[PDB]
Amino acid sequence: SQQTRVLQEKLRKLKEAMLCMVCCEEEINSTFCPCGHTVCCESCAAQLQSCPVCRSRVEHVQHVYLPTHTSLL
Amino acid sequence: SQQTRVLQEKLRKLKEAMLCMVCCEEEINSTFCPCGHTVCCESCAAQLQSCPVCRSRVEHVQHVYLPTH
Numbered sequence: 001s002q003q004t005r006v007l008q009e010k011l012r013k014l015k016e017a018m019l020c021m022v023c024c025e026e027e028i029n030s031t032f033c034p035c036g037h038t039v040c041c042e043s044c045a046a047q048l049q050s051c052p053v054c055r056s057r058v059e060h061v062q063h064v065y066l067p068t069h070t071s072l073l
Numbered sequence: 074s075q076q077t078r079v080l081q082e083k084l085r086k087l088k089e090a091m092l093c094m095v096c097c098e099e100e101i102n103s104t105f106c107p108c109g110h111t112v113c114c115e116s117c118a119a120q121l122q123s124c125p126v127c128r129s130r131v132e133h134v135q136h137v138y139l140p141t142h
C-alpha cells in the first residue's frame with residue numbers, strides 16, 4: 001500500500017542517519033573528543049584534524065560500541 | 074499489507090535499540106570511557122563505577138551527539 005512506501009522511507013532515513021557523514025558508506029562508530037560529535041566511521045575520523053560539525057580541534061577519537069551496529073555476520 | 078507489518082517491526086526494533094539499557098525510557102547519549110560502550114542515557118551513566126556490558130572500570134563518561142538525536 002502507500003503506507004508500505006511511507007514506512008520504507010522512514011526506515012531508509014533512519015539507516016542513512018547511521019552512516020558516516022563524510023563517506024556515506026560505512027557505519028558511524030567514532031566520537032570526536034572532546035566536542036562529542038559522533039558522525040564518522042573510523043577511517044574518516046582518523047583523517048580529520050577538526051570536527052566536521054562544529055570545527056572544534058579533535059584532541060583524540062573514541063571508538064563507540066553502539067547497540068544498533070550491524071555487520072556481514 | 075503483511076509487508077507493512079514487517080517494516081513496522083524493523084522500525085520498532087531499531088528504535089528500541091536506541092534507548093538506554095538501564096531505564097529503557099531515555100535515548101542513549103553517553104559513552105563509558107575508555108571501553109567505549111555507548112548504551113546509557115546521561116542520568117543512568119552518571120552513577121555507574123564499571124561498564125554494565127564489559128565490567129571495565131569507567132574513568133569518565135563522554136556525552137555524545139548522534140545524528141538521530
Ligand SMILES: COc1ccccc1-c1nnc(N)o1
Pocket residue numbers: 017018019028066067068090091092100101102139140141142
Ligand atoms: C539515539 O541514537 C542512537 C542510540 C543508540 C545507538 C545508535 C544511535 C544512533 N543515532 N545515529 C547513529 N549513527 O546511531
Ligand SMILES: [Zn+2]
Pocket residue numbers: 020021022023024025026040041042043044045
Ligand atoms: Zn567514513
Ligand SMILES: [Zn+2]
Pocket residue numbers: 032035036037051052053054055056
Ligand atoms: Zn564537534
Ligand SMILES: [Zn+2]
Pocket residue numbers: 093094095096097098099113114115116117118
Ligand atoms: Zn537511562
Ligand SMILES: [Zn+2]
Pocket residue numbers: 105108109110124125126127128129
Ligand atoms: Zn564496556
